[PDB]
């Protein structure tokens, strides 16, 4: 018996169920169960996620047994592997009671996993997901992980400061997480932002189109007005004092490319679709 | 104490609307439901009861469940109107019991048939061997005019438990509200 370089296998539904639950209960720690499968001594796999009511102490486990039952009879039976909750705008660190449920859980199952989530620090590009694993204190001097591979040591990331200020190595150990993707969900997830041929065959309008070009050309004239004075101006001031006196209201040479780009991309497609609609049709 | 799942096929067809039984076939088959639900109740609370009709759109009024009070609530205002339908009754009772959460329970079925059926013996042999695959021993207690001496039903049963199976059985429908405790005096555990 010894630790390893463990891996956290996920379920794509699990992530969304996380973020929607925590976001909906954003002003407080929202709790829930992590349901999955113990694939081996090395890696874990979560496939199902769900939560319960909380007014953090969960109420009647009669929801528990009936929930897992009806989840077994429809679909199949599975195994509870861990759990999760939120640290809204927090250091995604196991709170004092959060660790207090951990001696409760690891005593039940060995590889009981805590799951920290914050729907606050997560930007649309990247989410701040987290999960931890309690460690004993009796072995505070004795080694805890054999470290037989670089992956969970010098191959992952670097512990953050706001959670290292709480445990960072102590009272628990971090764990790596990845994403397994079925090809079935993968293909449909690939395509969810395309439209039908109607969109690709629309001709927006030439009254508001020509009205629009008539718009942008107008102020673009003024942008050229400013651009003449600015470019010819050229105080011999060194290439950085210009970069300190340009903060303000100064903006030639910037809008000029922009309006040209937009006026390009409009007129181009606007002509092209009209072309196709006549070549192809009749 | 045995594990099973009772599936009853009540008859709300038109031909149940008569008095070959003393009060009415509705009260007769209803009371037989009273004795079957108490029977399985006293046998094993783990066992579960589900009912089905034989009307145009044969209905699962109660999903297979150990409680019987719901079935008793369903028995009232049963509205025995329509036409007796058999081959789709054993079918809807057939594909239903594969939706069971508990699989140790043996798929059992009892049917209350009290209207003239129009089935075929090749149909009862196909359905019979189909009931050989899952071994759904069904004991039907007929309540009213069913067929010529319950023909195509002892053939259905024997073609169900062929080669000395004797698990399914066929009752009779000529005198009245047979005390099913007397009908299953010896076959009290398995009719």
């Amino acid at each position: 018996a010894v630790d390893t370089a463990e891996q956290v296998y996920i379920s794509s539904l699990a992530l969304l169920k996380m973020l929607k639950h925590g976001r909906a209960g954003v002003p407080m720690e929202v709790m829930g169960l992590m349901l999955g499968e113990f694939v081996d001594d090395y890696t874990v796999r979560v496939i199902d996620v769900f939560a319960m009511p909380q007014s953090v102490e969960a109420v009647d486990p009669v929801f528990q047994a009936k929930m897992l039952d009806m989840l077994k009879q429809t679909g199949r039976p599975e195994m509870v592997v861990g759990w999760y909750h939120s640290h809204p705008g927090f250091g995604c660190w196991l709170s004092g009671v959060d660790i207090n449920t951990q001696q409760s859980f690891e005593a039940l199952s060995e590889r009981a996993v805590a799951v920290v989530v914050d729907p606050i620090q997560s930007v649309k590009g990247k989410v701040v997901i987290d999960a931890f694993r309690l460690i004993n204190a009796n072995m505070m001097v004795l080694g805890h992980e054999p470290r037989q591979t670089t992956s969970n040591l010098g191959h992952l990331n670097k512990p953050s400061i706001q959670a290292l200020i709480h445990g960072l190595n102590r009272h628990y150990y971090s764990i790596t997480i990845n994403y397994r993707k079925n090809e079935l969900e993968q293909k449909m997830l690939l395509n969810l932002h395309k439209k039908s041929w109607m969109e690709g065959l629309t001709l927006q309008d030439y009254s508001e189109h020509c009205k629009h070009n008539e718009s942008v050309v107008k102020e673009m004239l003024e942008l050229a007005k400013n651009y003449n004075k600015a470019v010819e101006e050229e105080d011999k001031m060194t290439p950085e004092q210009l970069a300190i006196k340009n903060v303000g209201k100064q903006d030639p040479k910037r809008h000029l490319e922009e309006h040209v780009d937009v006026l390009m991309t409009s007129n181009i497609v606007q002509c092209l679709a009209a072309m196709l609609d006549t070549v192809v049709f009749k | 104490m045995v594990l099973e799942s009772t599936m009853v096929c009540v008859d709300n067809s038109e031909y149940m609307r008569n008095g070959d039984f003393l009060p009415t076939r509705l009260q007769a088959q209803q009371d037989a439901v009273n004795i079957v639900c108490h029977s399985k109740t006293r046998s094993n609370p783990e066992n579960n009861v589900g009912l089905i009709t034989l009307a145009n759109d044969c209905e699962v009024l109660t999903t297979l469940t150990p409680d019987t009070g719901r079935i008793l609530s369903k028995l009232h205002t049963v509205q025995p109107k329509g036409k007796i339908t058999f081959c789709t009754g054993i079918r809807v009772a057939h594909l239903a019991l594969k939706h069971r959460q508990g699989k140790n329970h043996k798929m059992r079925i009892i049917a209350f048939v009290g209207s003239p059926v129009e089935d075929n013996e090749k149909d009862l042999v196909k359905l019979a061997k189909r009931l050989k695959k899952e071994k759904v021993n069904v004991d039907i207690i007929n309540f009213g005019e069913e067929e010529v001496n319950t023909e195509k039903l002892t053939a259905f049963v024997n073609t169900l438990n062929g080669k000395d199976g004797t698990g399914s059985h066929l009752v009779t429908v000529p005198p009245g509200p047979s005390l099913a405790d007397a009908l299953i005096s010896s076959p009290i555990l398995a009719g």
């Binding site: 891996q7 694939v39 081996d40 090395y42 890696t43 796999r45 993707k181 090809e183 993968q186 | -």
Partner: protein, 159 residues
């Protein structure tokens, strides 16, 4: 099990390959290292097409990672220095979405092109070096150049 094939690596022992196969088909993580390496190692240069079909056919349905890794190296080693028939497998492995099997194919093109100074594979190998998303098959991508540059070793430090 891991060194079993490295010892019998030039002999091409079909006999050890046999029991190594059923060792590989245990559907486990502890035996994945047991068979996954020596299986191809005892078939180095063998080009046993049934061996390729076994390895790639089994590294599509598993659940562990070591059973993916030992196959990732065995499939890259089963073909040795061909440069002309391994192309179909290099494309088959690079077009994959497997974050390990692409990198498995990335190692492959290195061994199928052992030091190959062909400026053909350098285009798309060192192209998926650019557009590649997985860091694993990216590092395995850039780490095939020296494995394909003994013909002109002075060029690696320039690219």
């Amino acid at each position: 099990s891991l060194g079993l094939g490295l010892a019998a690596m030039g002999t091409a022992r079909q006999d050890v390959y046999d029991l190594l196969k059923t060792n590989l088909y245990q559907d486990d993580a502890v035996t994945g290292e047991a068979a996954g390496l020596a299986l191809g190692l005892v078939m180095l240069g063998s080009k046993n097409a049934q061996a390729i079909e076994d390895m790639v056919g089994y590294a599509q349905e598993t659940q562990h990672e070591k059973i993916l890794r030992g196959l990732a190296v065995g499939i890259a080693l089963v073909m040795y220095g061909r440069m002309e028939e391994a192309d179909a497998l290099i494309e088959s492995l690079c077009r994959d979405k497997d974050p390990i099997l692409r990198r498995s194919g990335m190692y492959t093109v290195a061994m199928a092109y052992c030091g190959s100074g062909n400026n053909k594979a350098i285009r798309r190998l060192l192209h998926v070096a650019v557009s590649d998303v997985n860091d694993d098959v990216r590092r395995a991508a850039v780490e095939s150049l020296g494995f394909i540059l003994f013909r002109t070793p002075e060029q690696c430090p320039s690219v």
